[PDB]
Structure formats: C-alpha cells, structure tokens
C-alpha cells in the first residue's frame, strides 16, 4: 500500500487515538488525523481524501458500527477500508460488523506488529 495513504483514527480517549498514531508511524504511515466520536470522523471524512480509518467500537454519540454503516451506504467514501477497534471481542460483535461492511477488527491493547498484521491482512484481502 501507499505509504501517504491518508488515516483517520476515531477513538474518545486521546491516549489510545497517540497510540494508535505511533503505531502507523513505526510502520510508516505517517499521513495520519484524528476524530473523537463517529459524528466528529463523518465530519472530516466529508473534507475528502481520506484513504483508511480505524475506529473504536465503542464511542459516545455515533458508535463504531453507526459509523461504519453511515459510510458503507453513501457516496465517494463508501469502500473506505475501516478497521474496528474493539476492548474485548464477542461474536455477535464480529459478525454485526463484518456484516455492516468492517474490513476487519482487532482486539485492543495491542502491538505494533499486530497492527502491521491486520493492515496486511486487509491490505491483500481488497488487492492494495
């Protein structure tokens, strides 16, 4: 993939959304914004050029599947790549999401190499 690809990271704890930035960083993805809500991330998905977001289940407000779907059904953005964040997985999460479009999830705490995982895995699952 494009190493400028342009990231969207959505996630109501600054702590997690540094994380996760500095974890695109050390793969080199450095093209990377921030949102705090779902409501925030369709507010600057709008502005265009956006290429990939990451996104917490679990947000105030727009939550990660409302997102997720609000997106799927538009449009320019409607195949945007959207990796879900989530604090414990449940199956009937997983398959709400993967239904609703998500391109793939992940279990948080997690590493740098997990994240290069995951992009990977989505990357060559649509072709990028």
């Given at each position: 993939?494009?190493?400028e690809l342009?990231?969207?990271?959505v996630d109501d704890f600054s702590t997690m959304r540094r994380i996760v930035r500095n974890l695109l960083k050390e793969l080199g993805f450095n093209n990377v914004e921030e949102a705090e809500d779902g409501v925030d991330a369709l507010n600057k998905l709008q502005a265009g050029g956006y290429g990939f977001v990451i996104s917490d289940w679990n947000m105030p407000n727009m939550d990660g599947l409302e997102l997720l779907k609000t997106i799927r059904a538009n449009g320019a953005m409607s195949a945007l790549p959207v990796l879900m964040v989530t604090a414990e997985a449940k199956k009937e999460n997983i398959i709400a999401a993967a239904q609703a479009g998500a391109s793939g999830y992940v279990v948080k705490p997690f590493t740098a190499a997990t994240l290069e995982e995951k992009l990977n895995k989505i990357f060559e699952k649509l072709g990028m």
């Open positions: 993939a494009d190493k342009k990231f969207l990271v």
